[PDB]
Enzyme design. Structure first.
Site, PDB file in Angstrom:
ATOM      1  N   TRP A  88     -22.702  36.118  63.297  1.00 38.68           N
ATOM      2  CA  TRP A  88     -23.483  35.966  64.523  1.00 38.68           C
ATOM      3  C   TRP A  88     -24.964  36.263  64.285  1.00 38.68           C
ATOM      4  O   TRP A  88     -25.325  37.356  63.770  1.00 38.68           O
ATOM      5  CB  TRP A  88     -22.963  36.846  65.647  1.00 38.68           C
ATOM      6  CG  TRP A  88     -23.849  36.649  66.847  1.00 38.68           C
ATOM      7  CD1 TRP A  88     -24.018  35.473  67.581  1.00 38.68           C
ATOM      8  CD2 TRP A  88     -24.743  37.603  67.417  1.00 38.68           C
ATOM      9  NE1 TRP A  88     -24.959  35.665  68.542  1.00 38.68           N
ATOM     10  CE2 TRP A  88     -25.418  36.953  68.482  1.00 38.68           C
ATOM     11  CE3 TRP A  88     -25.037  38.946  67.135  1.00 38.68           C
ATOM     12  CZ2 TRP A  88     -26.371  37.596  69.266  1.00 38.68           C
ATOM     13  CZ3 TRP A  88     -25.998  39.587  67.903  1.00 38.68           C
ATOM     14  CH2 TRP A  88     -26.641  38.918  68.970  1.00 38.68           C
TER      15      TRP A  88
ATOM     16  N   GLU B 256     -20.582  31.980  65.003  1.00 38.36           N
ATOM     17  CA  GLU B 256     -20.452  32.267  66.391  1.00 38.36           C
ATOM     18  C   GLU B 256     -21.693  31.859  67.181  1.00 38.36           C
ATOM     19  O   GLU B 256     -22.759  32.425  67.017  1.00 38.36           O
ATOM     20  CB  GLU B 256     -20.149  33.736  66.542  1.00 38.36           C
ATOM     21  CG  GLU B 256     -19.994  34.144  67.957  1.00 38.36           C
ATOM     22  CD  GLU B 256     -19.861  35.638  68.132  1.00 38.36           C
ATOM     23  OE1 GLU B 256     -19.921  36.394  67.158  1.00 38.36           O
ATOM     24  OE2 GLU B 256     -19.685  36.065  69.274  1.00 38.36           O
TER      25      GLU B 256
ATOM     26  N   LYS C 257     -24.133  31.265  70.628  1.00 38.23           N
ATOM     27  CA  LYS C 257     -24.526  31.928  71.863  1.00 38.23           C
ATOM     28  C   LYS C 257     -25.514  30.991  72.590  1.00 38.23           C
ATOM     29  O   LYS C 257     -26.288  30.242  71.963  1.00 38.23           O
ATOM     30  CB  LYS C 257     -25.129  33.294  71.570  1.00 38.23           C
ATOM     31  CG  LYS C 257     -25.048  34.228  72.722  1.00 38.23           C
ATOM     32  CD  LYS C 257     -25.420  35.631  72.284  1.00 38.23           C
ATOM     33  CE  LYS C 257     -26.060  36.435  73.423  1.00 38.23           C
ATOM     34  NZ  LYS C 257     -26.098  37.934  73.171  1.00 38.23           N
TER      35      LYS C 257
ATOM     36  N   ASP D 188     -16.871  32.948  71.950  1.00 43.02           N
ATOM     37  CA  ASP D 188     -16.981  34.152  72.759  1.00 43.02           C
ATOM     38  C   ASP D 188     -17.066  33.678  74.229  1.00 43.02           C
ATOM     39  O   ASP D 188     -18.024  32.985  74.576  1.00 43.02           O
ATOM     40  CB  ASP D 188     -18.186  35.036  72.330  1.00 43.02           C
ATOM     41  CG  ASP D 188     -18.248  36.397  73.119  1.00 43.02           C
ATOM     42  OD1 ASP D 188     -17.926  36.432  74.345  1.00 43.02           O
ATOM     43  OD2 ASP D 188     -18.634  37.456  72.545  1.00 43.02           O
TER      44      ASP D 188
ATOM     45  N   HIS E 109     -20.293  33.757  75.864  1.00 33.73           N
ATOM     46  CA  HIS E 109     -21.422  33.111  75.166  1.00 33.73           C
ATOM     47  C   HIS E 109     -21.781  31.673  75.718  1.00 33.73           C
ATOM     48  O   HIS E 109     -22.558  30.956  75.082  1.00 33.73           O
ATOM     49  CB  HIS E 109     -21.141  33.071  73.621  1.00 33.73           C
ATOM     50  CG  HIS E 109     -21.593  34.295  72.833  1.00 33.73           C
ATOM     51  ND1 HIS E 109     -22.194  34.200  71.586  1.00 33.73           N
ATOM     52  CD2 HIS E 109     -21.506  35.627  73.092  1.00 33.73           C
ATOM     53  CE1 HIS E 109     -22.473  35.411  71.123  1.00 33.73           C
ATOM     54  NE2 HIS E 109     -22.071  36.295  72.019  1.00 33.73           N
TER      55      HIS E 109
ATOM     56  N   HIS F 257     -13.326  35.415  70.596  1.00 33.61           N
ATOM     57  CA  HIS F 257     -13.664  36.751  71.098  1.00 33.61           C
ATOM     58  C   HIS F 257     -13.627  36.810  72.619  1.00 33.61           C
ATOM     59  O   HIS F 257     -14.302  36.010  73.304  1.00 33.61           O
ATOM     60  CB  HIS F 257     -15.025  37.215  70.615  1.00 33.61           C
ATOM     61  CG  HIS F 257     -15.031  37.646  69.188  1.00 33.61           C
ATOM     62  ND1 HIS F 257     -16.154  38.153  68.573  1.00 33.61           N
ATOM     63  CD2 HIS F 257     -14.055  37.655  68.252  1.00 33.61           C
ATOM     64  CE1 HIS F 257     -15.878  38.433  67.312  1.00 33.61           C
ATOM     65  NE2 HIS F 257     -14.614  38.139  67.091  1.00 33.61           N
TER      66      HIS F 257
ATOM     67  N   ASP G 264     -24.219  37.489  79.359  1.00 34.87           N
ATOM     68  CA  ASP G 264     -23.272  37.948  78.350  1.00 34.87           C
ATOM     69  C   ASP G 264     -23.325  39.475  78.278  1.00 34.87           C
ATOM     70  O   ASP G 264     -23.969  40.054  77.402  1.00 34.87           O
ATOM     71  CB  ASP G 264     -23.536  37.289  76.984  1.00 34.87           C
ATOM     72  CG  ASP G 264     -22.653  37.863  75.862  1.00 34.87           C
ATOM     73  OD1 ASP G 264     -21.423  38.122  76.057  1.00 34.87           O
ATOM     74  OD2 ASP G 264     -23.208  38.061  74.768  1.00 34.87           O
TER      75      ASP G 264
ATOM     76  N   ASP H  41     -20.722  41.582  78.094  1.00 35.53           N
ATOM     77  CA  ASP H  41     -19.673  42.195  77.339  1.00 35.53           C
ATOM     78  C   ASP H  41     -19.070  43.352  78.184  1.00 35.53           C
ATOM     79  O   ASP H  41     -18.994  44.496  77.722  1.00 35.53           O
ATOM     80  CB  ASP H  41     -20.173  42.632  75.917  1.00 35.53           C
ATOM     81  CG  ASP H  41     -20.451  41.409  74.940  1.00 35.53           C
ATOM     82  OD1 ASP H  41     -19.496  40.684  74.506  1.00 35.53           O
ATOM     83  OD2 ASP H  41     -21.650  41.182  74.579  1.00 35.53           O
TER      84      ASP H  41
ATOM     85  N   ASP I 271     -14.502  41.459  72.089  1.00 32.67           N
ATOM     86  CA  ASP I 271     -15.826  42.028  71.870  1.00 32.67           C
ATOM     87  C   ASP I 271     -16.415  42.484  73.180  1.00 32.67           C
ATOM     88  O   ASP I 271     -16.772  41.630  73.988  1.00 32.67           O
ATOM     89  CB  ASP I 271     -16.785  41.001  71.242  1.00 32.67           C
ATOM     90  CG  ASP I 271     -18.179  41.591  70.960  1.00 32.67           C
ATOM     91  OD1 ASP I 271     -18.439  42.795  71.235  1.00 32.67           O
ATOM     92  OD2 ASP I 271     -19.035  40.849  70.456  1.00 32.67           O
TER      93      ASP I 271
END
Lengths: 402, 402
Positions: free
Chosen positions: A169, A210, A212, A243, A246, A270, A278, A280, A310
């Site tokens: 990432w 990954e 984003k 993700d 993301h 993820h 984002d 998380d 994540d």
């Protein structure tokens, strides 16, 4: 109580849903849990209380959560979790020795290890660019690091007899509107080419990229976009890692899985609850999580979708974040296992949208709890909310003393 | 015209050469879609009055709009626009003979033609599935229509000595939540494979695929998804066609051009204004269009991006719709060519985010009008609003009498 389980099973069995086969199957799906929830993404280089600040604190904390999560899983690590032994070691110089203890501990516990190079919180990442930085000496440092990280991943897989996923990432982008979107992307491609130049047996290591859409401080533009990594991975036989936080507003990881399975042997995932950006937050047992599980299961992709967590919520008990997070994804896969896919598929084939709607709906009130509780009993973790007691005592006796 | 000359000096001071820009602009063709002129009726066996009713009317209308659009362009045709001389011809039996009158017209005006098979409004599309229909006889019929459409685009290219873009857009999906997202997509993949089996020279034909996120009738799921198409087109060396209305809320085509040119030789693009769903409002000279133009110009991609229109607005004069929209994309290209890229690039490379921002912003008030007006006179089209007269005259003298 156990009649509840027996009664629950005949309800699913009226559809020809074998719950015994589902539990047998569920038992074996591993979830890769992320070390950085334990110490607020501190690592070991150079607001809720009780975090880990020490490798031996972090490993104990991981053990606590694992002992509350049914099954056998993996632990996902970042390079900054290297154990240097009190020596300043630069990121381009990290080596298998620097993760020897982690690997020993993983072996001890029957765990897999997944890895990530770290391309943030660092002098050489200060301009907000790394693999895609204008300066050749900066790009090369980060390249060497990623190569070092692949080596470390190869080390994990060879040692643990389970392939490690080494995921890249990058934070690279701009706060404001760029005047060139092409040149940084071009540099990224060139950096990744070099990172993957050397072949690694895929019994030991697999690589993932990954994407984003945006980050705080990378708001108007990030270099490694969805279209970029999707093309790159496909061109160079690499895994895309997705993700759930993301992507765009209303944008759905569940809709992508099936399409990716047509063109990629394997896919990585993820899970994290995004709230408006984002963020998380901790994963919750929600519609889109259920929907993902349905795609994984429906598409016979349990060995094709590498499932990871994540999130970093520092506002709550962190052992609890792990235990809630991971139990939710397991519960979602279980629910997806307990769906009459064959009848649902047939209905869709024959244009019977009425029944497809109706039963999808009716399945939301099927006795999932009773199947979930029995499975916890057999897998020797506490049922329903009882795992909270275990966390309360560990907070008092251990976490609150730090 | 002295007005022009002062303007040329303001730009020339950044070292931007307006005469060079104008000569590059003159060169760029925009593919104008025929279906705005008859409200997507075609000629197969409330709103604003005087829509084209017959090919001769449709051609007249196009000639008129073209006469108000500076430059030399192209017309994008849909299969339902076949001329079958009073005979019923099935879409799978469509041959080049059914388009010679279009080709003769195109050649006489120096126009390129682009093409599309027609996969909607037909008995064999009533279930809202086409290439992904569960029934093999349905798929086969539409496969044949697409193959036959590739031959027609081939005919175009041989005949007009510019290659034809034959674009595939399918309405396939489901209204409500599907219970299987993979199998329809496997089927779409298989269909397409067959459609593209026979090679055709890229001098005469290029094939494209167009992803949508969602339409009326298909809200929850669209077989031909962005991820699906991106992978398909990459594996099979075909074009992606991006429609600026086919994406998520806050999702931009301008952020994707640069990523895609890093992996694809050529890109197609349809411009239309989406207002909250894929509504196909007339393109306007807005932020995203300028940003699209910037990406095309500053990535050197004026020959790599096949630009076309896609919009159907019935609430206003249809010749005006074409003239506004095409004039807007050309205006945006001009805008892009008159931006100091070299300095802005260098400033980003340097970290001078203050000048990057300030200067992109100051160019928002540079004398674009004066250049744009000169251009329009050089190219023999009315300036400013004055093309409304020609429209008013044409409406009274022709469209009133229909």
């Amino acid at each position: 109580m156990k009649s509840q389980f027996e009664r629950a099973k005949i309800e699913y069995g009226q559809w020809g849903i074998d719950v015994e086969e589902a539990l047998e199957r569920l038992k074996q799906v591993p979830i890769s849990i992320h070390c950085w929830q334990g110490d607020d993404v501190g690592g070991f280089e150079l607001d809720y209380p009780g975090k880990a600040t020490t490798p031996e604190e972090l490993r104990m904390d991981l053990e606590k959560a694992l002992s509350l999560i049914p099954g056998k899983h993996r632990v996902n690590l970042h390079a900054i979790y290297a154990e240097t032994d009190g020596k300043v070691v630069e990121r381009d110089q990290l080596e298998p020795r620097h993760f020897e203890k982690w690997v020993r501990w993983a072996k001890r516990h029957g765990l897999g290890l997944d890895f990530n190079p770290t391309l943030f919180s660092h002098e050489k990442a200060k301009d907000g660019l790394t693999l895609a930085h204008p300066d050749q000496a900066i790009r090369q440092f980060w390249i060497d690091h990623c190569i070092a990280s692949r080596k470390i991943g190869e080390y994990f897989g060879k040692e643990l007899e389970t392939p490690c996923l080494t995921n890249i990432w990058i934070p690279d982008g701009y706060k404001d509107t760029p005047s060139d979107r092409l040149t940084p992307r071009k540099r990224l491609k060139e950096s990744l080419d070099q990172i993957f130049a050397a072949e690694i047996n895929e019994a030991y290591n697999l690589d993932a990229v990954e994407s984003k859409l945006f980050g705080i401080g990378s708001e108007s533009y990030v270099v490694g976009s969805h279209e970029f990594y999707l093309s790159y991975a496909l061109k160079n036989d690499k895994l895309c890692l997705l993700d759930t936080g993301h992507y765009h507003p209303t944008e759905t990881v569940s809709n992508k899985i099936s399409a990716m399975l047509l063109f990629h042997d394997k896919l990585a995932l993820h899970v994290s609850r995004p709230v408006r950006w984002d963020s998380d937050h901790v994963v919750t047992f929600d519609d889109e999580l259920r929907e993902i599980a349905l795609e994984i299961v429906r598409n016979d992709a349990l060995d094709r979708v590498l499932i990871g967590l994540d999130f970093f919520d520092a506002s709550i008990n962190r052992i609890a974040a792990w235990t809630i997070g991971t139990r939710n994804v397991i519960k979602a896969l279980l629910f997806a296992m307990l769906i009459p896919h064959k009848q649902l598929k047939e209905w869709q084939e024959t244009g019977d949208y009425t029944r497809r709607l109706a039963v999808l709906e009716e399945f939301k009130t099927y006795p999932l709890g009773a199947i979930w509780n029995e499975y916890c009993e057999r897998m020797n973790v506490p049922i329903k909310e009882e795992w909270l007691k275990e966390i309360a005592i560990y907070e008092k006796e251990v976490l609150l003393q730090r």
